[PDB]
Write a protein that binds this ligand. Structure first.
Ligand SMILES: O=C(CCCN1CCC(O)(c2ccc(Cl)cc2)CC1)c1ccc(F)cc1
Ligand SMILES: O=C(CCCN1CCC(O)(c2ccc(Cl)cc2)CC1)c1ccc(F)cc1
Ligand SMILES: O=C(CCCN1CCC(O)(c2ccc(Cl)cc2)CC1)c1ccc(F)cc1
Lengths: 212, 221, 220
């Protein structure tokens, strides 16, 4: 039975080599500049119509990578002491696209992610206070603010602020932050389930499109 | 030779046991049909809408007086009235509990600084009648918010979730019907995981205990 | 010579340990010394309020190092680190920290609101710039504080605090400092999950403790 462990580790090594080669040779569906430009073109419109136009355009530019209307749902998000709402359009293990915002405004922690985030503002204001600094910057509709991996900032969204977000990195690690206040502050298990279901629907779509 | 009108005593005993079993299992159900709420659903709102024109101090005092006059033995006395902090859903305010049962509660809530956060999903229906200030509500699934001013009442259905914002110096009365302990579970989340203010935990639990003691001593006398 | 009961000598040793512990606690309270006076940090920081908060912080650090050498962290150990607690978020820079005392620069460029925290310690805060809204427990009114003023937070008191944009202050705290650090990391653990900030805060406290120990044993 000593060779059974050798066979198990051999199969495991070949499988891990497959996984490594696949993770290495994977391309990305979206480009940061693509999402940024699509969101900047629609910043002048009201956020409802801008969301609609951007979703239609994303669907026509990358078919099979945008959730259908039957699976689009606004879901609240409580994290880092702030509260907003998001609608997920695309979600994989390495990429995500969503619409985020708040009609009341909010303030809190940006989150320390293993990913690169890009928020292009459709309406409102985005105040960012970078770590180690004593001043804050402000971003207005049409501008794009980037969150590098391992960075943490303080964030402040003014009333009626809405943006398009494109994240790229270790996506399953970000759920730990985005659901922290849902577990320990709001105890909103229904919203937790809705978020997990949106993520799973995005994964399902990506898998079926990759398999055809 | 047995008369067809007689009844065996053991069968009669067992049949009376079955009869009391059925009668008890039937009248236990009617307890959920004879449910009596101490306050009407819109009574608290129509009561507080009258004192909205005054400052919150005098308004609270006169409303407490009138509520004691209307429902004697159902409002906590001046000895047990206490302002305690409430940290929940990422917002912070203060409450003063006037009535508390396992299915109903009434309190004076508000904030002198303003706050924002998550309303919470309760197994209960909440009603907030504004005495002073502003109340901003952002319902789930929408991308817009509504504002409520003194005199108006905001109704929060069971299972609903909204984002909320209280401006500076907002004060309201509040009435709630449903599983009150489940809502107390939410009202103490940030007190445990954010503020660590165990004295506030003790204060809120003591207010609830005083309300329950008053509701039980009124039922017995 | 005679014997003592199994419960007799037990209660006798209980009383002996009680006497020893009580008199030792009293002896420790008698020998308690504080590096900074109760109103020293506030008086010193009020002199720099109104200036640019950067210039004020630099001059205050220089002055504190001049007045108490060996009790202020060196430049290579000063670091701005975020703090998330009671629903509010800001940034701190620790200048002095032991088991009984601490001195820091606190503030936020965005403003925040939350729970002050209930401590076993007396905490004074002298505003360098910005605004400080306070709401005391049991009241329905709030008091505003402007630069130059000092807000005192007594042991066991709990208030609702609000900092306006670009609010910066100097803070001196005296009491059970570990119990205040416990509150200082609540949201960092259960809300932000920023383990790097947790490490930074604990490392700053450890550096303050190390400096205090070295100066106590070797005299700065
Ligand atoms: O919703 C999220 C979490 C992103 C929050 N999202 C990132 C950080 C943010 O706070 C930010 C701060 C500073 C900067 Cl510079 C840029 C972005 C904006 C909001 C999510 C995560 C996983 C998932 F499957 C679905 C949704
Ligand atoms: O703390 C509470 C619950 C009331 C919170 N109180 C109601 C919900 C609230 O979040 C709300 C938001 C929006 C709307 Cl529309 C209505 C109500 C505002 C604060 C409590 C009170 C007494 C008790 F024994 C146990 C718990
Ligand atoms: O404990 C802390 C974090 C200070 C937060 N610090 C708490 C009190 C504060 O929140 C406050 C509230 C109300 C009032 Cl009135 C005044 C001050 C201000 C900020 C610490 C930091 C470094 C260290 F090495 C040891 C301990």
């Amino acid at each position: 039975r000593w060779a059974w462990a050798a066979l198990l580790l051999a199969v495991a090594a070949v499988l891990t080599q497959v996984v490594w080669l696949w993770l290495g040779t994977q391309s990305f569906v979206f480009q940061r500049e693509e999402i940024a430009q699509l969101a900047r073109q629609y910043a002048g419109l009201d956020h409802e119509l801008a969301f609609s136009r951007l979703i239609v355009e994303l669907r026509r530019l990358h078919p099979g990578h945008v959730l259908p209307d039957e699976e689009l749902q606004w879901v609240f998000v409580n994290a880092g002491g702030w509260m907003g709402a998001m609608c997920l359009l695309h979600a994989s293990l390495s990429e995500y696209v969503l619409l985020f915002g708040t009609a009341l405004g909010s303030r809190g922690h940006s989150g320390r992610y293993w990913a690169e985030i890009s928020d292009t503002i459709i309406s409102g204001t985005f105040h960012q206070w970078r770590e180690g600094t004593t001043k804050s910057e402000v971003f207005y509709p049409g501008e794009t603010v980037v969150h590098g991996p391992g960075e943490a900032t303080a964030v402040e969204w003014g009333p009626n602020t809405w943006m398009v977000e494109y994240g790229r990195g270790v996506i399953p690690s970000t759920l730990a932050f985005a659901l922290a206040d849902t577990v320990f502050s709001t105890q909103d298990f229904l919203t937790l389930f809705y978020t997990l279901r949106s993520y799973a629907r995005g994964l399902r779509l990506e898998l079926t499109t990759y398999l055809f």
